[PDB]
Paper text:
To further probe the catalytic significance of the shift of the oxyanion loop, we produced PhAPEH and ApAPEH. Not only is the shape and position of the oxyanion loop unchanged by complex formation in these archaeal variants, but it is also locked in a conformation that is very similar to its forward shifted state in pAPEH; thus, these systems can be used as functional models of the enzyme with a more restricted and confined catalytic site. We found that the archaeal variants are quite selective toward their specific substrate Ac‐Leu‐pNA, not being able to cleave Ac‐Ala‐pNA, while pAPEH processes both almost instantaneously. Furthermore, neither ApAPEH nor PhAPEH is inhibited by meropenem, the bulky carbapenem antibiotic that is a potent inhibitor of pAPEH (Kiss‐Szemán, Stráner, et al., 2022). Attempts at producing a co‐crystal structure of ApAPEH and meropenem were also unsuccessful—using the same protocol that afforded co‐crystals of ApAPEH with peptide‐like chloromethyl ketone inhibitor (Menyhárd et al., 2015; see Data S1, Chapter II: “Substrate/inhibitor preference of APEH from Aeropyrum pernix and Pyrococcus horikoshii”). Conversely, it seems that archaeal variants of APEH contain a pre‐formed reactive center that requires no adjustment upon ligand binding. However, no such shift is caused by the binding of CMK‐derivatives by the archaeal variants of the enzyme. In fact, both the size and the invariability of the active site of ApAPEH (or ApAAP) and PhAPEH (or PhAAP) are closer to those of the “regular” serine hydrolases than to those of pAPEH. Here, we established that this same Pro is also the most likely inducer of the backward shift and flexibility of the oxyanion‐loop, and also demonstrated that archaeal variants that carry Val at this position do not show the same promiscuity (Chapter II: Substrate/inhibitor preference of APEH from Aeropyrum pernix and Pyrococcus horikoshii).
Acylpeptide hydrolase (APEH) or acylaminoacyl‐peptidase (AAP) is a serine hydrolase that regulates protein metabolism. It can also bind to and process unusual substrates, acting as a detoxifier. The most prominent physiological function of APEH is the removal of N‐acetylated amino acids from the N‐terminus of oligopeptides and proteins (Perrier et al., 2005) thereby exerting crucial control over the proteasomal degradation of damaged and misfolded proteins (Adibekian et al., 2011; Hoernstein et al., 2023; Hwang et al., 2010; Palmieri et al., 2011; Sandomenico et al., 2021; Shimizu et al., 2003; Shimizu et al., 2004; Tangri et al., 2021). The S9 serine protease subfamily, the so‐called oligopeptidases, employs a further, size‐based selection process (Kobayashi & Smith, 1987). Their active site is sequestered in an inner pocket that is formed between the catalytic hydrolase domain and a propeller domain that caps it.
Residue numbers in the entry:
A (entry chain A): 5 to 581
B (entry chain B): 6 to 130, 133 to 493, 496 to 554, 557 to 580
Write the structure that this text describes.
């Protein structure tokens, strides 16, 4: 059967075009601040009275977390054509579309930020350092240098609270001061801190993710004491979460917590379970006295909903035919090499037979999760007639500290076996007639890792924005990613070499498709050029697609088409062979 | 917003549109036509409006039938993409019933004529001229090279041969005794041949400057110019003779060419024909019929002199209106010589509008008024197409072809650049893009280096990046061509890999992954140099990359069109 290219393009472009919204906070006069992919690009909008107002001109990457009622929004715009060197732009909410560049900040990798209306506190990674900056009337000030990736969580008064990846894959809590600066790190011996919000008593309420569970703890920044937080309702404690998505104090003092287990989240106010649509939820805001959150699911693109009715305020609509191309989704537990149960989401295509063509779609990160959340790539594969298997290999989030840290020191090892077991499960369970592997960033590294370490398991592979050589990538990384590479490999350069797919090209026996941004910082192109030379010299058949002016974060419809369409075409072509 | 799916939908139809060629008249006054679509070839009978398929499985070609014979000889590949073929006979009264001609072993069938009594064909295994009759197969002569049967009248067989010397020779043979008589044209090259009722050989003699209609006496090899009753043909001043043949009533039909377009002549008198290029001419039910193609018209069967299509592939109302009209312009170049340039205008672009200079490869080739899927796809996507016959092109005299010798991406680049400046000066181009494949891709890269600012973006396909590297890396034949094409000093200066610093516009690379004539290793070096110098570029490397199928278009054409569509924002 011939590949139906034109339908694939039409399906792919419609799935990319559907509006996707992100909830950021409440500004001005009870205006919802939302980030949305609408009209083919990423923009920032004010929502109020059933209408949206565009705040930015040219597409953005994100905005900083606003304090309630501040009369401005701080845009974050990549000004390096995908290299993730960002700049900050202020937009007065009273004059949307009028941007003022914050010229006191030089282009750096902006990692997080909070705007109190009086000061703009953020974390940025330059070539030599990750630091916690503050921008006010007295100029730009560095408050502290951070030993790796750090993100601002909350600011109440003079106290700043955040989260830091400062060692061995565990997340530490940190505090600083707007007036005096400095840094104080809070490490937990039970697990990692997940979210953080400063209480009215100037404490730090934080989520603590231990080996197999998660709970709320109170951290006194004065002496570092930690105690379990008790809530006036017991719904949260009996919910027994394994991960905490986000928490924060509402302006009326109530504590909102979004926690999750088995790829689905729940909303709690002062411990009480609030009804929310099935799936995954973002931050919770108080808007005109009502609770608003974001909602997403494997069949529902990210949307803005009110609680507890679950009724949408902003959502993109999918055409019925695309809705039908996803027959359903389920979570199954795949047994891996050492007897661990790998939580795996399966997306059953309504346009494939059973057994039928199946793509194992490996998520990136690796500190990320295949959850019941919208995946544009997974939707395109179901629309093109592929079942999608999404394994949360070890190193994934959402299933406890123990499962997440198992990857530390073992890239392309135990987690690769998890991917293989899910693939073998698909065929052995009667779901898959043939097996393909596909992934981007770290998922693209896994594809190369799979085709080199386990030839013959899959029929063909798609590696997008992949890691090819840990050594060269480390030499081409900034302060943050160099530290991140060190934690992932456990400091071992021997792990950096033996676990690099570039050093195992001889083993490849399957057709390979390479897709790569031309000027991405996280995953540089120069090692990929070396990989293609290796493939050619060793007589391996491959195809490569290098997309320019795009990096890790795509914020236009055209670039998203150009990095996804080659993958679907390649797999559809392979299916007829 | 770029409508990627609208571009792909249009490309599918331009690839899938049924194209027709005219083979002759068979059985009871019925046209024999060949239909080609998506690399699939079929043979049909046309009489009344409905077409009757003659074959069961797709074929490779058919042999040339004599007027009115009651059968067709099909040529079909013995395997998938195998150069060796088999012969199948089909009675025109029982279509769909194929009888394999088992007396002919599988071989490379080169040409053939069916008289209704004997099947005479050339085939390569040696290369020989064969005859198949009731008594079986006979080898009439062994040919010193690739040869092709042109015509049979009585026992006299006439054909054309690549028998050495660089020129095409005329040869005769006998259907009874066999044998081989070769006629060298000296300063000339035969292009077509038909045997006159008086058993002389009328042939087209293409030369350096102007083509000649000559008579060859097969008895003594005397060559003399043929003067026709009407003088329209001589005054037409053709540079090539596409095809000629005697109609059943003894009149001589001639299709000749000049400046990328052809004209139809009957005993020297010109017949009105739709603008473009034409195939063979037949007399069918007292009317003249031929095939017609142009930059705006896929190959089709038309009636003369009205030009009314008898058989043409369908194109939707939108796509048809998007591909709107072609013209020939004479672009004044840098040296005073005029560059013959064809222009295909888009109905989806304004004037001035986005315009792509589509550089042909070879370089010994020609941009004529013929159907081109690339140009049509560009026009369908909202681009005017400018196709210049830069020095080195064929079809405009030996002097113009030889002027490129010793000046790679030098003199001929100016002709391409002059064509781009012409598109601007004449008010057609609002923004300029350059695009080419094989040698045309080499032109694109060298143009972006030596003429930055001229074009807004470039697409380079199957290009040559470094002649110095190419010469030693390539085989004898290609290396010999490189020597005549480019002094090693010129080889390095004309190689665009050494001028990557000068590139200033986005560049799209489309390259085969496993091509011996265009290796991938040099292009990987170019991509490394582009990245090290901060040059914006897009790259598409596809294994096993002539657009016959949609699959071919997806690999080689869609990335170019997608790139240009987003480059215009
Ligand atoms: C290819 O065919 C060549 C032709 O018969 C001689 O012009």
């Amino acid at each position: 059967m011939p590949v139906e290219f034109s339908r694939i393009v039409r399906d792919v472009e419609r799935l990319i075009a559907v509006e996707k919204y992100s909830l950021q906070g409440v500004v001005d006069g009870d205006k919802l601040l939302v980030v949305g992919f609408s009209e083919g690009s990423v923009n920032a909008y004010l929502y109020d009275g059933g209408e949206t107002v565009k705040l930015n001109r040219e597409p953005i990457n994100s905005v900083l977390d606003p304090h309630y009622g501040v009369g401005r929004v701080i845009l974050v715009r990549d000004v390096s054509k995908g290299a993730e060197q960002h700049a900050l732009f202020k937009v007065n909410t009273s004059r949307p579309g009028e941007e003022q560049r914050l010229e006191a900040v030089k282009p750096m990798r902006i990692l997080s930020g909070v705007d109190t209306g009086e000061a703009v506190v953020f974390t940025g990674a330059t070539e030599d350092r990750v630091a916690l900056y503050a921008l006010d009337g007295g100029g730009l000030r560095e408050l502290a240098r951070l030993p790796g990736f750090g993100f601002v969580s909350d600011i109440r008064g003079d106290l700043i609270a955040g989260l830091g990846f400062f060692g061995g894959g565990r997340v530490s809590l940190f505090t600083s001061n707007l007036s005096s600066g400095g840094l104080r790190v809070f490490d937990s011996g039970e697990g990692s801190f997940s979210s953080a919000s400063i209480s009215p008593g100037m404490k730090v309420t934080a989520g603590l993710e231990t080996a197999r569970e998660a709970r709320l703890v109170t951290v006194d920044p004065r002496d570092g004491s930690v105690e379990d937080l008790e809530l006036p309702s017991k719904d949260f404690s009996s919910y027994r979460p394994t991960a905490i998505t986000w928490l924060g104090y509402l302006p009326d003092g109530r504590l909102a917590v979004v926690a999750r287990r088995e790829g689905r989240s729940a909303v709690f106010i002062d411990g009480e379970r609030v009804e929310a649509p099935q799936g995954n939820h973002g931050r919770v805001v108080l808007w005109r006295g009502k609770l608003v959150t974001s909602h997403t699911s494997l069949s529902t693109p990210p949307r803005i909903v009110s609680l507890p009715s679950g009724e949408p305020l902003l959502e993109g609509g999918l055409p019925e035919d695309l809705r039908r191309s996803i027959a359903g989704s389920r979570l199954v537990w795949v047994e891996s090499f050492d007897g661990s149960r790998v939580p795996t989401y399966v997306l059953e295509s309504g346009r494939a037979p059973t057994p039928g063509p199946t793509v194992v779609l490996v998520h990136g990160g690796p500190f990320a999760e295949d959850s019941d959340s919208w995946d544009t790539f997974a939707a395109s594969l179901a629309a093109a007639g592929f079942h999608v298997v999404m394994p949360n290999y070890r190193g994934s989030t959402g299933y406890g500290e123990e499962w997440r840290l198992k990857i530390i020191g073992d890239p392309c090892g135990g987690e690769l076996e998890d991917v293989s077991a899910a693939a073998r499960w698909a065929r052995e369970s009667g779901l898959a007639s043939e097996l393909y592997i596909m992934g981007y960033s770290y998922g693209g590294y896994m594809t190369l890792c799979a085709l080199t370490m386990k030839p013959g398991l899959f029929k063909a592979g798609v590696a997008g924005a992949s890691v090819v050589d840990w050594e060269e990538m480390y030499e081409l990384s900034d302060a943050a990613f160099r530290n991140f590479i060190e934690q992932l490999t456990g400091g071992s350069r021997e792990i950096m070499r033996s676990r690099s797919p570039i050093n195992h090209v001889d083993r490849i026996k399957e057709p390979l498709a390479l897709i790569h941004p031309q000027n991405a910082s996280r995953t540089p192109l120069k090692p990929l050029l070396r990989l293609m030379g290796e493939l050619l010299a060793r007589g391996k058949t491959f195809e490569a697609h290098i997309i320019p002016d795009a990096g890790h974060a795509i914020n236009t419809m055209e670039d998203a088409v150009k990095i996804l369409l080659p993958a679907v075409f390649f797999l559809a072509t392979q299916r007829e062979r």
